[PDB]
Curated annotation (Swiss-Prot), chain C:
Taxonomic superkingdom: Eukaryota
SUPFAM superfamilies with a match to the protein in the record: Ribosomal protein S5 domain 2-like
GO biological process: exonucleolytic trimming to generate mature 3'-end of 5.8S rRNA from tricistronic rRNA transcript (SSU-rRNA, 5.8S rRNA, LSU-rRNA); nuclear mRNA surveillance; nuclear polyadenylation-dependent rRNA catabolic process; RNA catabolic process; RNA processing; rRNA catabolic process; TRAMP-dependent tRNA surveillance pathway; U1 snRNA 3'-end processing
Biological role: Non-catalytic component of the RNA exosome complex which has 3'->5' exoribonuclease activity and participates in a multitude of cellular RNA processing and degradation events. In the nucleus, the RNA exosome complex is involved in proper maturation of stable RNA species such as rRNA, snRNA and snoRNA, in the elimination of RNA processing by-products and non-coding 'pervasive' transcripts, such as antisense RNA species and cryptic unstable transcripts (CUTs), and of mRNAs with processing defects, thereby limiting or excluding their export to the cytoplasm.
GO cellular component assignments: cytoplasmic exosome (RNase complex); exosome (RNase complex); nuclear exosome (RNase complex); nucleolus; nucleus
Protein localization: Cytoplasm; Nucleus, Nucleolus
Major location (coarse): cytoplasm
GO molecular function list: mRNA 3'-UTR AU-rich region binding
Protein name: Exosome complex component RRP42
Note: Present with 7110 molecules/cell in log phase SD medium.
Gene that encodes the chain: RRP42
From Swiss-Prot, chain D:
Name assigned to this protein: Exosome complex component MTR3
GO molecular function: RNA binding
GO process annotations (BP): exonucleolytic trimming to generate mature 3'-end of 5.8S rRNA from tricistronic rRNA transcript (SSU-rRNA, 5.8S rRNA, LSU-rRNA); nuclear mRNA surveillance; nuclear polyadenylation-dependent CUT catabolic process; nuclear polyadenylation-dependent rRNA catabolic process; poly(A)-dependent snoRNA 3'-end processing; RNA catabolic process; RNA processing; rRNA catabolic process
Name of one Pfam family that matches: RNase_PH
Coiled-coil zones: none
Additional remarks: Present with 7380 molecules/cell in log phase SD medium.
Swiss-Prot record, chain F:
Subunit structure: Component of the RNA exosome complex. Specifically part of the catalytically inactive RNA exosome core complex (Exo-9) which may associate with the catalytic subunits RRP6 and DIS3 in cytoplasmic- and nuclear-specific RNA exosome complex forms. Exo-9 is formed by a hexameric base ring of RNase PH domain-containing subunits and a cap ring consisting of CSL4, RRP4 and RRP40. Interacts with LRP1/RRP47.
Span of domain S1 motif: 69-149
Listed GO biological process terms: CUT catabolic process; exonucleolytic trimming to generate mature 3'-end of 5.8S rRNA from tricistronic rRNA transcript (SSU-rRNA, 5.8S rRNA, LSU-rRNA); nuclear mRNA surveillance; nuclear polyadenylation-dependent rRNA catabolic process; nuclear-transcribed mRNA catabolic process; poly(A)-dependent snoRNA 3'-end processing; RNA catabolic process; RNA processing
Cellular compartments per GO CC: cytoplasmic exosome (RNase complex); exosome (RNase complex); nuclear exosome (RNase complex); nucleolus; nucleus
Native organism: Saccharomyces cerevisiae (strain ATCC 204508 / S288c) (Baker's yeast)
Additional comment: Present with 4840 molecules/cell in log phase SD medium.
Name of the protein this chain belongs to: Exosome complex component RRP4
Record note on what altering residue 98 to P does: In RRP4-1; temperature-sensitive(ts) lethal mutation
One Pfam family cited in the UniProt record for this chain: ECR1_N
Swiss-Prot record, chain G:
Disulfide bridge positions per record: none
Lineage of producing organism: Eukaryota, Fungi, Dikarya, Ascomycota, Saccharomycotina
Keywords of this entry: Cytoplasm, Exosome, Nucleus, RNA-binding, rRNA processing
Main location: cytoplasm
Subcellular location: Cytoplasm; Nucleus, Nucleolus
Keyword Repeat recorded: no
UniProt family annotation: Belongs to the RNase PH family.
Residues in the signal sequence: none
Superkingdom in the source lineage: Eukaryota
The organism of origin for this protein: Saccharomyces cerevisiae (strain ATCC 204508 / S288c)
Annotated Pfam families: RNase_PH, RNase_PH_C
Descriptive protein name: Exosome complex component SKI6
A cellular-component GO term for this protein: nucleolus
A GO term for molecular function: RNA binding
Amino acid sequence: KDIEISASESKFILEALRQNYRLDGRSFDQFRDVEITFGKEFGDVSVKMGNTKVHCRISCQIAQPYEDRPFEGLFVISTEISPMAGSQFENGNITGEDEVLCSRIIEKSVRRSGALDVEGLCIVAGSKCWAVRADVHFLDCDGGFIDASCIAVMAGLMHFKKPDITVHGEQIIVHPVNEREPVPLGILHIPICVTFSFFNPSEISIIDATLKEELLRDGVLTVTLNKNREVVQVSKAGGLPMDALTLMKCCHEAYSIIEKITDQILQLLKEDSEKRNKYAAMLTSENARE
Amino acid sequence: PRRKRLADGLSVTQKVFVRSRNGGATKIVREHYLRSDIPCLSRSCTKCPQIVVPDAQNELPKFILSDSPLELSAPIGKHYVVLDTNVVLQAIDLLENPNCFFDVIVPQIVLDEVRNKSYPVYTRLRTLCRDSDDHKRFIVFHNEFSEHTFVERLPNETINDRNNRAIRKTCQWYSEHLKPYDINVVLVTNDRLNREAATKEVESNIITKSLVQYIELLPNADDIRDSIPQFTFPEYYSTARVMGGLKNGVLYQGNIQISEYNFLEGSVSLPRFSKPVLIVGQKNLNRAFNGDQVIVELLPQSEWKAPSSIVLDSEHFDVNDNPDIEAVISDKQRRLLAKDAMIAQRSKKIQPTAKVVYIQRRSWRQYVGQLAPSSVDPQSSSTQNVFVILMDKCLPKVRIRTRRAAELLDKRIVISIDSWPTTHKYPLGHFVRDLGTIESAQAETEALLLEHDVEYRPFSKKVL
Amino acid sequence: MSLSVAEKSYLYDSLASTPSIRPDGRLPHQFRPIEIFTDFLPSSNGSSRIIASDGSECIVSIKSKVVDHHVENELLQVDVDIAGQRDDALVVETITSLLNKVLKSGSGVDSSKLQLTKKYSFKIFVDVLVISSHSHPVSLISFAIYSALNSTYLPKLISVEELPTFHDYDMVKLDINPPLVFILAVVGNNMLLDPAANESEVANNGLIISWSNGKITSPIRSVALNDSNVKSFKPHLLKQGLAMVEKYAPDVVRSLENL
Amino acid sequence: RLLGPAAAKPMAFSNTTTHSEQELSLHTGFIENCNGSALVEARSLGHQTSLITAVYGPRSIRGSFTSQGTISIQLKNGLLEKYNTNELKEVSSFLMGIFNSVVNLSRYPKSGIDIFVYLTYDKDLTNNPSQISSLIPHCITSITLALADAGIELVDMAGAGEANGTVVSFIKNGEEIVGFWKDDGDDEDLLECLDRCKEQYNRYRDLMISCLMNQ
Amino acid sequence: SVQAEIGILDHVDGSSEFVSQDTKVICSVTGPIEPKARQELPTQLALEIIVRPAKGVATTREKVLEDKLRAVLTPLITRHCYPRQLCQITCQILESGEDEAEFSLRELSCCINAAFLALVDAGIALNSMCASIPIAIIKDTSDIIVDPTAEQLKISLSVHTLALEFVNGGKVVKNVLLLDSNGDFNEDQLFSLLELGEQKCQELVTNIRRIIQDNISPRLV
Amino acid sequence: VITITKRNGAFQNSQIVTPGELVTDDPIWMRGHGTYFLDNMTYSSVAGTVSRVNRLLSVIPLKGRYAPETGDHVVGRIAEVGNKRWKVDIGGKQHAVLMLGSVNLPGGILRRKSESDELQMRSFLKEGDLLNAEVQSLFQDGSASLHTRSLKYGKLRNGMFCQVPSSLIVRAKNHTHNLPGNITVVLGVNGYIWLRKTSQMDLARDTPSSWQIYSDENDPSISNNIRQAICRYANVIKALAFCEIGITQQRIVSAYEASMVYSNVGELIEKNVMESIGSDILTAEKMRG
Amino acid sequence: MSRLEIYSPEGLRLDGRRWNELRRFESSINTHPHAADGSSYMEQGNNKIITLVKGPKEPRLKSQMDTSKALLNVSVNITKFSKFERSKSSHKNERRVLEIQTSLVRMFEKNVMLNIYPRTVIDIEIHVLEQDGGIMGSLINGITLALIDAGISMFDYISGISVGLYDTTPLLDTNSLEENAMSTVTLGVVGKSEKLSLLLVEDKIPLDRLENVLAIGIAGAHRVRDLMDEELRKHAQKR
RNA sequence: UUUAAAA
RNA sequence: UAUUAUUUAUUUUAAAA
Ligand SMILES: [Zn+2]
């Protein structure tokens, strides 16, 4: 019930790496071309980078805040993997290493690192708050699971819109989405994950390994940056021991990637906003005088 | 009473104390490290430069206290000054005077008590230390961390008794530590009980004088003697009590309109009188916001006041208060509140006054304002309680908890009040939205429309 | 380790004899050497560690919570966690249900000694962590919760009804009579006290007896020690075992309350 | 759906709004899924008890090489008077220590026997405020009935009785004790507990054979 | 009009994507593959049906959605020519296209059409063809409508899911695979929509046959 | 009575090399256990003393399980009956394997066809049975291969089992010895000891097939004084192990006679009496001879 | 406690230490001889950890047997009383434990020579009795010392240290209060080398500030290796 | 609780 | 009967002639 790699295939891919050759034709520091597609409802995002395809789905509901932080909203994320992305995955295996690590990294990047404005999700302190949920669906597994999932969640949160709320003394009314247009969430910074795969025949490091390269891997490193030159999160455990010089090279190379991907999400959101707001030029209330 | 030796001169003990909060107990244990490399920071000292250690930026500590202090009359002569919590909170303005204090020692236990009771005062005290130069010199001696000055707690000893004793042990050590250089240590405390306990400690005699006694001994006493400085809301009535009170002509219903230039004077228009009924004071307003429908109860003619003739807003009132205050006086407010008391005594316009006893409808909404820089820790990424100065001057300060106080600084934000119980001095709100930077044309206009419930959102798509 | 059927019949015939030939050869009333540590968890109101002779180890922690007894039923909760076993295991839920009966507020433990105001009282959280176990550890845990409750310090109360306040430094000592649990193994017609690992494997049945206030108290059980040789016992053996603990329990309390 | 809204609270009934003989009924053989069935009901004073016991066995365990059989007893809540799951499993381990001394285990090598007791209704009609002790004797009689109906060999019948929280299970017409359970109660009392339970044991020992010999 | 694609996923034997109104369902099929010990059938093929919601985790709602989707695909597959083998059919609901808390017929209908197309792309032996449509009747004017919108469901008296089996060029209705009805209706309304549905499914397979032929024909020679 | 040692306050009461450090830079060496080769230099993988024998460079760690070697009279317990072999618990890193063609079968060979090989083995050698055998050879991973191809090795009975650390077994010519009181000790070099009543074979063979040895039937009549003698032997053997004293034949009978002072063996479990008997042997024998 | 000074201008922290001073480090070996093959009672500051290594032994079931190396299983048990407030078990709190356990397995499976022990398993049972910041680093130190006690062959030491960055000042061995007020980096340094086997950054840190934090992190971790190494010297010479 | 007009 | 065996294989000595 697992993937079988022949000895010749393992030797060919590794020797190709020793000759600066990747089967797909990318460089060692080249990220796969990401493609963001937005659905009908808000918070519906499908990410395609190479043969890897992931689909995200944002939702929210009124919930009880944590008693330790009565002024913050909750953030939930589930990254279960179905046999759809490959028969090597068992359906119902929620506690798998890939599922746990993917959830924890996006959770640290979004919730813990302040990417999502949880204080803006506060309705009534200590009682009512927004619980923004992010569902991730692994459609086709060709490596880069957490890299694609982090782009899907961050694109979904910036594309998602929550119902409106009016403060009337001690009363609070939630407008239906059919009456008033929903309000977008608060997104401070945009964290993007970049995973590095290491090999040894003098070590070789490739960015965003495919499924075949991921299986012949000797060590994995995940970094998360934003356009503000901040290191949102780093996860490296085991594998080939590395030093501070190799990491900083990974972070500087990843910053060149996350900066371009950030500008793409901002541009692709702007294009999607205009597509669904054709007659928005007539409905403007706040207008300039003369 | 445990203690363990570690590296060179380093030892550690176990600090245990019980914390009572919301009727619940929590035993708290903390590591307390005692060290012997803390300098006296006196330029005259020739025993501490040999034990100092550079900081994280590899920089040796500069010795601040002058080698030729102010020489007073015998037997004081050359002396350093050590303060307690009371003097720092009371005469903080006198400390900033350039013709008063010159070489002052602020111990750690005093600095911690000031920060716990007034953060803006603690900040101005650290500023005296940081800005020490030729005419002003302030230091902080970490007496609680020094192996020589740290004092264990005695059985059944008051919490204030130990901290008062820690101040004495600090002066006793400084007195002995500076004997070679012929410099005395003058302890300035207003606690008469603390000074008497210092006279009983014959093992190390120190000089203790009050604030008025120390000022009179200065050479320029005739010039600085004129600058010396000298709660719970009543619960709301029951719903049954306000029913019979309105029925039997005891209570009255109306809407509070806080005065234009004074956030502590409100008037309620009643059909019985031609002049609106004044409500003066915090206790009489009883946690009411401008625009609420309240229930008032008339006060006797012994308490009737005149319309106030002073200007007050939340920003210029109780500026030295912490937001989390629950169940420190400025000299400027003393000279201001007592000044208005003379007007309400000699005035003829004394009209009936009442007090709020019940809130019927809260006029709360989304208010716009900015954070008070006096209560923000610019380098802290932890949850901290900060003040919010609302745009509407008729409203008080709002306390909110936020972990982005540094980021939200110099921003124009939106909040909404959650509650205001009898025990809290200030209302509790929460952050909802950030509009932009202060004095930004895009943010100030949007903050203006929100402050007047102006619908600036685009028209509905059903309008098409 | 396990035991072969050859040596199983060797111990049965030697233990059931009128001169009880114990494996280590002790008397049917002698216990094994025990090491007990106390007061090592600063974050807890009370703590204790006990190490049995066969390497068995148990750690107990005691936390406190201010609760309104008019709405909180049980003021003493026991939470057991055996290493290498799930939290919903049968061997864990049985001891958890049994230890909450020996330490039930108002029964084995009087709720008056941990009360505060007329409205409020203290709730004791007894958390058990069994690191190693070779036999039924309900008797070894009872010794650990004994030494921990007799070294527990709770915050002193400072005293119209309002929420209670406590002093900053001074704390009171928890004076509660902590019940004790003993395990008895019957091998034929002989009653054994504190059975070892191999001894409890050939026993015909077992007895659990509580002990509080210098007398036998509820609850008492007769759970089996091994599903192989489960034999019914004569009621005179139940009386002999119930009377044997009365003869040697004060020797335990005296050797256990010294701390 | 299931569970329902989390914001809902269960109904609360206030006590201040408006204000010898132990009956027994036995049946057996009525569940087609299992081998042996049983249904015992008892209503004395203001406490009515009705529980159902099913026996699924003997089941041949694949790959097992045990010499004797293994008994698995599991108590399960029903619809009224729900007990905590920890105390239910405590009575299960106490019951397994009883039937392992009664059921002929050597007659079932490489196999196991699974017992299922359903406390479907435990009514209590006290006027104004362990309660599980009043059901242990009724559960022991129910399992012995279903074990006998399932063709499983049982060395003598097994019954028990309650005496103020004291539950004692006898065998061989009370000659030897097979189980002892006592919660709450008083001190010194023991001779009267073993006597009141023994006469209650003989009352159940012959009444079980009554319905087992008829039908 | 409905949209559908084939062979979209790489690491599975057969995939598809079915779209109707706003309901989008991506389905994948992998088989025959090695079954688990608790799955193998001695004589025929075993099926593993999995449907996952667009939001939240898989609840009991999708469990009855699996059981209905299983009852449709099981007679539609020649299970006996794959003894001791496994087929994994996984449906992923991208957008529900309806109120999930109230209705689930628009998702069941799309999962049937997505699973059938994915089974065609995978190469599993199918006994025939299949089509599924949702049917509803409006409260005020008791009118039968085929493929109702999300707003029409909230104003309907009863909802229906009709799944038919087509043989011989998509003209002969061999059997009625699934007819799931909930709401208020009598015997006259049943055969009125059943007759109406038989001709709307008849033009669906005619359009489905065109969809799959436009994709499989360029693959073959 | 109970002896409860109480403590309050805290939680509890040649060249040495550590894993990672350099032991030598001489390439002319043969690396042994606790030692790994790297970059023409030699490093340590455990924490212990450096050993040098001819050219074999190794590190002997402090704590370590029993390392089986060829020709060891061990005592092991059967874990499972596997395919054409047994898994016997010797006490090492892995279970030792006992092949079918390495024991004295009851009827000489298998009686087939009827049952499989595995099921027929459980009739006389089931799981949990205790026996003794000799390590015939070793596998590449270090696993031991046992054999019972002599009347000396068989299935143990008529006694009690005890366990001591493997390092505390002094090497000698004889593995099992006869003891006063009609008792025979089986000092397994792996740390497993079997104290039993002296049988007809070990008494008549050390002084100057059939399935009768695979019988689980114990001896019918054992003297009540002989069984109580085994307890004292077990208590003094575990006492010498508590005092980290090597176990030999003379030190067993020396502690057996020195334990007469304590009458019944009930007080032989305390640590004060254990350290006394251990110190009485280490001083009155090593300093007197 | 209350509002405190994190790093005073006098270079003193809230607990009295300085920027490069570690908490008290009291380690112990062979604390559970009759319950495991390797034992280590780690007491780093107020952190109290019990690490038990059981192996190499035969797997209980052949479903977890590797014919070329040993299997490494790390079980981290965080007691309900590890903090002040007795924490109740949360469904979300179980995910953070699995991430730590996996990070520990992947860390030590590369440093422990599993090839020398084939067809075996090595169970690592951990019990956290009290935590006060830097718990991830202290878990590493307990595993390293417990594996050495069990005689398991390793390539070198693995030292765990936690570094915090406050404004522009890095701080070594962060406690619970300091972690609540700054960003924290945990490191897994291999022996005296500058090689990392673990690097967890769970809070925002500027990129230009990360280079220096790692240097001071690997440096302070060498000091942790010395404290662990010396404890093994004293325990070997006295026995 | 700022009159009126155009914005 | 380890030059023996395990079949969707728990074998962990298949080497020499
Ligand atoms: Zn000095």
